[model samples]
Target: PKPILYYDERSPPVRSCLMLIKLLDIDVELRFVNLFKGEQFQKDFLALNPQHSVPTLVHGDLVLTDSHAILIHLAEKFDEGGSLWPQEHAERMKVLNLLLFECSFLFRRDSDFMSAIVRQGFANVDVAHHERKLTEAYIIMERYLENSDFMAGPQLTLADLSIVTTLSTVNLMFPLSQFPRLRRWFTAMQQLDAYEANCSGLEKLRQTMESVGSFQFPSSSAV
Candidate 1:
């Protein structure tokens, strides 16, 4: 049976899963959940995931909630050559470490910015603070890329998919030019077919931002 993915297009986490599905060429049934309109709180969705989060994966009796977990599972189950997750213990550990950093730091900061934007317009929030925090996250990523082309290592892995999705959104609000390595990485990531497919969702998120009043991205010079 084909796996079903419950997602909201504007969500970076959900798009990460979608990008992986595209890269792996996996057949998945996509079910849109209008997160902005609070569709995630519906009883049915809550039943599948009590946390009512987007990017819920349902494959037969198996159900997964966290996007990081979903990414690992998909790579393990579908990546036949073990390229995405890697077979060597040491190599896999590097990817795993980045995945942890992504989930614990990168994505968490991204989520905080998004939540503030949705609940309170950018004008109402602390724009400089968010940008500073994101810059700190990007600095760590820049350091990581100083040695390798990708987040974890030479080849693209699940860590790249996960971090890029959120980082892409953060880039829209806070440009990545200052981080030379990360900026170079962003350009390379954009060239991928899977990343291109996810670009539409990013544009959609931008459009939604328009309705939230006005976009206010303070220049770094001002910060």
Candidate 2:
């Protein structure tokens, strides 16, 4: 098995792995496991990933879960010399710190926003709470993006790929016009060949949302 990536086509974690594959030019086979249909909860998938998460990476003896961990491992193992992860300890730490922040704050907040709308069907039980948090996160991201092309710094590090995969989901759930900087960043990231190659499931994700009639964005004028 030439590094099988068991993924849910619509998952952010899967998207992250796709971006890494594209960036590293790693040759691998993608096996789709539909999360919306609860395919990830199957016994076979659970054997591979006990947490039942998408974007599980299997290479030789290694079976890796979690988007960030997969990205780090792939970058270290497949990338030339020191590219995506960075060679210097301090620089690497800086990137890791920013990536961690993205995971703990921005990504979580965005997921919460989507869950509030899509899962709960927008019941107004402090649904705006997630929106407010997401907006705050976007403001911080915009400011950082305005200063640099990539998330961690000038170089396109793993952090950039991670954040891009997370933020790209916002486009499906909302119109990003208010956050111009983030919009620009998202557009730029999409321009990368890796992004284009891995974004095949984006339209499907949008379609699924439409089918459920749970895909409406909050009116910008409301705030």
Candidate 3:
């Protein structure tokens, strides 16, 4: 049975899984959940995912909500060579660790910051603070890339696909130039045809941010 993927193109997590699907040529049904119109809160979506998040994967009796998990599952089940995810325990651990960092730390901050602006019209959002944390994430990734070509190791893995999508939008807000290794790694990821999935999504995010007053967040009272 083919997997059914619920996704919103503007979402980073969703894009990450799309990249993997495209790369592996997985035959999955893609459904768009129109978040802006409260489609996620609909009855059908709620039954599938009570959390109602994008990038939900329903394959036979298996269901996955997190993008990292979906990426691992797809790679393990479909990628014949295990090239996207390592089979060796120690090497695989490194990739898993980096994937954890992306969701727990990097994307957590992104979710919080973007939610404030998108949901609440930028009220009470400290733009500078989010920028600071974003740079910290860049530094962390920069350190990780110090000795390797990709985020987890020499070859690209699930870690790169996941982290790159998150960074793709975040980098639009905070330029990647200051972190040379991160910049270099990002540039390298851009060379791949799979990475092209993020191009329109990034532009959509940029336009959305522009509509919300350019990530500046002027106080509501002043406006």
Candidate 4:
């Protein structure tokens, strides 16, 4: 039996792993779990992953969770030394750090703010704080491209796969035109085969929070 994945396309992290799986040409069974309908909380799913996270991978005997973790594992296991994660220790280490940083500063922050817009009526966030924080992350990404087209290397790596997926979701509200270089990098990323795989769901997210005008948030206290 092939691997099985539980996912919702509207999720950027889930999209990241999906793109990687497509890029690697790995055939896996996909199971849909609509968080909107609370399908993830079903006993069957919760039994496999206590965390109840989508993007959960169940191979013959191994279970994997976390999008970037799944991205790295698939690239290393399936890509035949492809540049997705890079084989060199120095370069690989750099990508790992970038992955962690992306999670902490960009992806995690994105999840919180968007959840505010989607699950709750408003994020109740200091929009200023989140805007400034993500803007800083975008600028750093721009600088990463000063030396190479991709975020961490000349070729599109898992880093590109991960960031483009996350930031594509982020772009629905925060226009990339403000960050020209990073915007251009994402455009370049769009040229790859797996690009559309990530974009379809991102577009479908229009069902909710397509723009700042589309939603509002109230903060009880100053951020």
Better of 2 and 3 by TM-score: 3
Please write out the lDDT profile of model 4 over residues 105-185, one tens digit for every residue: 789878776766654444455667667767777787888888777778777788888888888776665656567788778
- TM-score: which candidate is best? 1
Candidate 2 is scored at a TM of: 0.87
| Candidate 3 per-residue C-alpha lDDT over 1-223 given as tens digits, one digit per residue, 9 for 90 to 100 | 8999998888899889989988888999989898767899999899989998998999999999989999999998999568679988888999999999998999998887787677666655687898898888988989999978898888999999999988877776677656888878888889999987877776676677667643542223110
> 1-223, model 2: which lDDT tens digit per residue?
5888898767776787788887778998888888888898899889889999878999898999888888898888888576679998888997898788777998888777666656656554375576677778778888888887777777788888888776766655455778777777777787888887447766566567555544454445211
- Worst lDDT 10-window in candidate 1: 214-223
Deviating ranges (above 4 Å) for candidate 2: 122-127, 213-223
In model 4, what lDDT does residue 28 have?
A: 85
Prediction 2 global C-alpha lDDT: 0.76
In model 1, state the lDDT of residue 13: 87
Model 1 root-mean-square deviation = 2.6
Model 3: lDDT of residue 198: 75
The Cα RMSD in angstroms, rounded to one decimal, for candidate 2 relative to the true structure is 3.0
C-alpha root-mean-square deviation, each candidate: 2.6, 3.0, 4.4, 4.9
> Relative to the true structure, how large is the alpha-carbon lDDT of every model?
0.86, 0.76, 0.84, 0.76
Query: Which runs of model 4 end up more than 4 angstroms from their true locations?
Result: 119-126, 210-223
